[PDB]
Structure formats: C-alpha cells, structure tokens
Structure 1
Amino acid sequence: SHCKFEHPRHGHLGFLPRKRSRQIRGRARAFPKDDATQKPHLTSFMVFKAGMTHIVRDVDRPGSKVNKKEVVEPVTILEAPPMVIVGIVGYRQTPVGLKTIGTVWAHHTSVEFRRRYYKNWKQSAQLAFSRQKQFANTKEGKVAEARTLNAFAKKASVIRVIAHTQLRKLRNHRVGVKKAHVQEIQINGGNVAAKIALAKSLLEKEVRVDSVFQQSEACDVCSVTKGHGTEGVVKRWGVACLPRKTHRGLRKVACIGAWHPARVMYTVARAGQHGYHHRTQLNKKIYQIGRSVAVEPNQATTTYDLTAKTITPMGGFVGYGTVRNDYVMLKGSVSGPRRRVMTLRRPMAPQTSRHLKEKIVLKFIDTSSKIGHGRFQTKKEKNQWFGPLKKDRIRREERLRK
C-alpha cells in the first residue's frame, strides 16, 4: 500500500558513502576546462582557514530593493602564504585514462617539503632527495632532465606543477604540522610548449595568491568538512523525531523497509560517520585579496572607513591566532574548521551571471572581538571608553619610581 502522504526524501543520495575523507586536505577532482586561447596560468592555491567575520558594502544591483544600499555580509578569512613550486608532471591520454609521463624536480627542495616523506624527521637520517640532488647535475642526469622535458612536449596534453604550502612563513602556533602540504596545480592556457615554459620559469620560485586570483571574482573551495563522529539518524540525515510515548526510543527511523525486498536498502537512512567529508562548493565570491602585515599595517582600512586597523580581530581569531601573511577573503562560509588547509580553485561554473560579474568595493570590515560580544573596533577605542584603570595607574607609578 502506498505511503499515505508525500514528503521529499531526506538527504541527497549522491553524497554517498558518507564515510570519513581519505585525506584531510582539499583536493580538486577536476580542474577547469583548458582554453588553449588563454595565457598559461595556475588554477588552484592552498589557503588555511582563519576564523570568519562580517563586512559592510553597498550593492550595485539595478532592479533590486537593495540597489545602492549597504548590506552586511559575512566573510571568511583564509590565510595564504605563497606556495613554492618543486616539480612538473605531465599526463598523456590513453583509452584507459590519463597516465603520468614523469616528473622533473627543482634541484633545490625545502626542508619542510622533504619532511612530508618522514613520519619522524628529527629522529632520522634525513637523506631524502639526496641522490636525486647529486645525479641531477651529472652529465647523464642533465640529459635525463631534458629527456623527460621533451617527452612532455611529445606526449603530454596536461601539464601540472607540484607546489607546497611553505609552512615556515606560516608562523602559526596552532597549525602544528611542520611538513608541507603537497598538491598538483594544473596549467591551463596555450599549447603544451607554452605551458612548460611557464612551468619551467616558476620552478623553485614561490607563487603568490594574487597572481592566481583577482579581487572581485569567484572560485571553488575544495575542502574537508568539520567532523562530528558517529551521529544518529536525526543529526546525520535529518529525519523526523518520533512521538514522545515511543518505546525503545525517539531518534530513530521507524520503518527501515518493507517485508519485500527482504533487505535493507542503501536509500534508508542509518547512523554512522557524520562530518569529515570532502566538498567542492562552487561560486564562492572573493572580496579582498589581502597583503601581509610586513607590507600592510592597515589591512581592514577602507576608503570609506579610515580607521587604521589590520584584519586580525581584538584578541585574535578564536582558536587560531593572527593572520601574519597574505589572505583571501571570500563571501560566506567554507566547509571545515579553522586551521584546516583548503584549496581555492578557479570556477567551472559559467561566471556570466550578473551576481558573479559584480565588482566589489567594501565600506567596513569588522575587527571587533570574536570572544564575547565585539564592542570596540580597535584597542585605541577601548582606551578611550576606559580611561586610566587601576593596573595602569600602578604601572604609571612604577614608571615614575623607575
């Protein structure tokens, strides 16, 4: 007999299996489509999540009820130290797939790059990339570098480079990892001879985030969801909770199937891992590509808001610290907790809708505290509400006593 009333089923069935991610980092399963009429350019960049805040900006949207009026939008801060290129891979088309031809290396690799090869670096011989380093400038090894660079020019359709996050310029105390996060970034643009020349030129040289993205564009954010353990069916799938007088329990799915087919189906919601899942989340509009504090002591300062202040709030981002490097600022949320490495990748969606072409100018960036209720935008404003306090008048008493 049919179900007596209709509701749409619970949970998208295309995000199955809802199992833990195989790896903690965001990894692109597909790059944008290669336009060979463009100029060669990188397509992804790894940033780390550093809390979130909100902004104020006026809206250019003709027809809308909020046209030329100021909105408050939440933004997420993603710290981006530059990544250093260490390799060049090239992939050739087969009827099986897309096979790797080989990789050249940079002749000089970082300590934190070849730390990724060790479960224990400090208690080790540390001699990785040590025979490749010395063979690469022999007579036969300078041949073998140019041997496989030519094999890219013959067989490869896809040229990628291998970068790593360069975590020692990320002077962060809470991201506790010291080995670098390694991914491959695909070159798109030009023919294969024009991709390798851009792959050779930025080799053993750091690439900075504002050379990959622009200020008022969008991107995809490949990132791994915040993990929540084993959760039941109400938290995980969002099923309705049963009436109060139910025996053995409320937070269950009552019927898990008919008598026939005499099996539980994959469509029936069950309990298990919730969170720590990979998500791609397209069309994340970017609002500000920031600049390091060694360059910019005044990061959150706008034309329309001349308060001299950085992007880091009062008392720091909660659980994270201070944004010490370049940063991107995206509209809204990205999947994952703070401190987690995330991949900003160029969009595969058509970036032609009038919401996505819109140029962004800000008017205010909230640099108030995220601990408690934020009240002051700078520490100069808290020293004008509060005058000299007691601990200041006895520090001024030690400074006169000397």
Structure 2
Amino acid sequence: HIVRDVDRPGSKVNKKEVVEPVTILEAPPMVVVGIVGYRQTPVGHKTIGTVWAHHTSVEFRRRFYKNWKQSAQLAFTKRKQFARTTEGRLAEARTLKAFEKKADIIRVVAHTQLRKLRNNRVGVKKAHVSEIQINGGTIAQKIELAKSLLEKEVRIDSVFQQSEACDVCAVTKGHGFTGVVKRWGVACLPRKTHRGLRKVACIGAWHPSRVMYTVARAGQHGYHHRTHLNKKIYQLGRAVSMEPNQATTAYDLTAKTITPMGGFVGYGTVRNDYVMLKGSVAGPRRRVITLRRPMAPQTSRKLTEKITLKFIDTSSKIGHGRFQTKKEKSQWYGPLKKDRIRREERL
C-alpha cells in the first residue's frame, strides 16, 4: 500500500492524504518473433500466413516439447536453413504481398523471457507465447512497424503510460469442489434440520418435471477467466540493477527498493521492471497475467486524474512489520550477542 494526495474539487477528501493498496507485477521485456495477418470473410476472420524471425531463443523453442532435454531439438531447423536463400526471400516477399492486398488485422507473435525473470519459485522454463494486435495507421504502416520490431525486445514503458488505465485478463484462484453456500451464497437452514444445513431446500416445483439451469448446485469453484476493466497505473518502475532507488519519493528521501523486508511471501525478489496497479488483481502469485489497453471511455474525472505518490510501504509482510528498512532495525537494537562474537573472533 501507498500514500498520496487526492485532487478532487467538491469532495470532502480534497487536498488530503489517503491510503490505497496496490499490486506489484514483474514485467521483463518481451521478444517479437512472428507476424500474422487476418482477412475478413462472411463467416469470420481467417489467417493468411505467418512470417518468422529466423533467429529464435532456446526458451521459445522449449514451448513445442514435453521433454526438451531428452529430445532431438529439431524445431525450426529446416526453416532456418531455407529462410535466407534465394527461394527463401521470394517466399517471404510473396506472403508480405498477400498481407498488403487482403488483410484487415495485423498481429505480432511475442514471448516472454523466463531466463531474465530469475525466479526460484516459478518452475517453468518454456516461454509463454501470445499474440498482440497493432492498432492505428494503415495496413502498409502496420507492416512497417512489425518488420522493424523483429528479433528485438519490447519494454512495457513503450506500451503504457504512468497515469493511464488498463484491463486485466487473468485466471482466478482455485477452490476445488465446493458447496452451494460458498459457491452461490445461499442462506443456511435452521439448527434443527434433519440431514444437514448447508443445502438448498427446494430445487424445483412439481412442474416442470425437471431441474432447471437456474438452480444452485455444488461443484467447481474458482479457476475461471475474468477481465476486470479500469485499473489505474500508479508507477512504471525499472530494474533494480540499473536504478537502485525504486521506492524513493520526492517526499521521502530514503533509498529503498520495491521489495519488502524479507521478500514477497512465496515469490521472492523483484529483479526486473515492474508496474504498480491500484487495487486487486485476479489470481495468485506467480501466475502470468495479460494487461490490455482499455475499452470503456476514459473521459471521467477519476480516470483522468494525475497520480503523485508520497510514501511506499516496504515493511515485512511476515508478522506485524514495523521497520521500513534494515538500517531501522539495526538502529533500534544495538549490537547483539552474535555481532559481539563476530567482532571478538575478528580480533
């Protein structure tokens, strides 16, 4: 959570400080490897083809195998031997011509870099691959941008701004097989009920002679896909190796990073670029999340406000944290018994 001053004329909280919880998401740069074009038909959109980058990393090609280490590792081998030959250049020029003539949508195939995200609890080593659409301009201009962004890295600062909003496509935390009280929120029955309380008493009338799809039943809860629009960006950070003072504010000159004391519980250190979003986000820690540019109109006063942070909390999330940095702890306690022994051994 953070502290900031709110600018909102006509409100009882105007020009005062508030406390708002936030979410931290690690954002290593992505790599673009492909271009796909779509044409519109009376039955829907159909893919025209794909243009590949001729140079792919090991973590990208891991996605095509279930046991990569004990395998021949032959993916994309023939394409590499053929792409730059005279027949190879002609074939690519043919596909690009079809993109120009008969396409309405241009997208790029991109994958994350799990080697740079040096996380100990994320066990997967094969990259996550997805498609990202290019908006704006004409078809000719769209293709030019896609070709320029081939084999290169894309940073999150080039896609989003500091005080904008975004959408959060994610998958919810799982709960397994759960009953109607937790799954749907129905009332519990009186203490005297024979054969149990946590149930729906009547699941239908005599007619129609069947159970309808609108009645609550027990089953799977959680692990669903949601969208949850209109989440405001509060900060666009950079990697701790290049900018050590991540959580330092103009109103708080302490030098500290975004990682709490003792690390994020179950996750660890944030060693990469990151985004700070206001509020909550679906899913547990370590899950991969997609952020999208908004669909709803962004002309409201709440969505156009400029955010200036004042204080970022970095106390330990284990127990009741009460120190902001490690120096605060070493100033409250003086030298301890173990420090004295180390000094005595140094003598």
Give the TM-score of the pair, scaled to structure 1: 0.85
Distance in structure 2 (CA, Å) of the matches to 1:251 and 1:399? 66
Aligned to 1:119: 66
Query: Which of 1 and 2 has higher RCO (CA within 8 Å, sep 6+)?
Result: 1
- 1:91 is paired with a residue whose SS is strand
Deviation at 1:296, TM superposition (A): 1.1
Give structure 2 stretches of 5+ with no counterpart: none
Aligned to 2:225: 278
Cα deviation, 1:6-57, whole Å, max 9, x if unaligned, reads xxxxxxxxxxxxxxxxxxxxxxxxxxxxxxxxxxxxxxxxxxxxxxxx0001
Q: Please show how residues 299-338 of structure 1 align to structure 2 within 5 Å.
A: 299-338=246-285
Distance in structure 1 (CA, Å) of the matches to 2:253 and 2:190? 57
Deviation at 1:155, TM superposition (A): 1.1
Cα deviation, 1:204-228, whole Å, max 9, x if unaligned, reads 1010001000001100000000111
Cα deviation, 1:153-197, whole Å, max 9, x if unaligned, reads 111111000110111000101111000000000000101111111
Q: Please show how residues 289-368 of structure 1 align to structure 2 within 5 Å.
A: 289-368=236-315
- 1:383 is paired with a residue whose SS is helix
Runs of 4+ aligned residues of structure 1 deviating over 3 Å after TM superposition are: none
Aligned to 1:4: none
Deviation at 1:381, TM superposition (A): 0.6
Distance in structure 1 (CA, Å) of the matches to 2:188 and 2:315? 39
Distance in structure 1 (CA, Å) of the matches to 2:344 and 2:36? 66
Aligned to 1:147: 94
Q: Is 2:146 the partner of 1:199?
A: yes
The letter for the 2-side match of 1:334 is V
Return the match for 1:381 from 313, 328, 335.
328
Distance in structure 1 (CA, Å) of the matches to 2:261 and 2:93? 53
Deviation at 1:316, TM superposition (A): 0.3
Identity over aligned pairs, percent? 89
Return the match for 2:187 from 214, 223, 240.
240
Return the match for 2:177 from 224, 230, 233.
230
Aligned to 1:174: 121
Deviation at 1:138, TM superposition (A): 1.6
Aligned to 1:215: 162
Deviation at 1:245, TM superposition (A): 1.2
Q: Which is further off, 80-89 or 140-149?
A: 140-149
The letter for the 2-side match of 1:355 is K
Distance in structure 2 (CA, Å) of the matches to 1:242 and 1:389? 58
Q: Is 2:207 the partner of 1:260?
A: yes
Cα deviation, 1:204-260, whole Å, max 9, x if unaligned, reads 101000100000110000000011111111111111111111111111111111111
Deviation at 1:140, TM superposition (A): 1.0
- 1:101 is paired with a residue whose SS is strand
- 1:382 is paired with a residue whose SS is helix
Aligned to 1:34: none
Give structure 1 stretches of 5+ with no counterpart: 1-53
- 1:198 is paired with a residue whose SS is helix
Give the TM-score of the pair, scaled to structure 2: 0.99
Q: Please show how residues 55-74 of structure 1 align to structure 2 within 5 Å.
A: 55-74=2-21
Distance in structure 2 (CA, Å) of the matches to 1:92 and 1:245? 65
Distance in structure 2 (CA, Å) of the matches to 1:393 and 1:195? 66
Equivalenced residue count is 347
Return the match for 2:43 from 81, 85, 96.
96
The letter for the 2-side match of 1:107 is H
- 2:206 is paired with a residue whose SS is coil
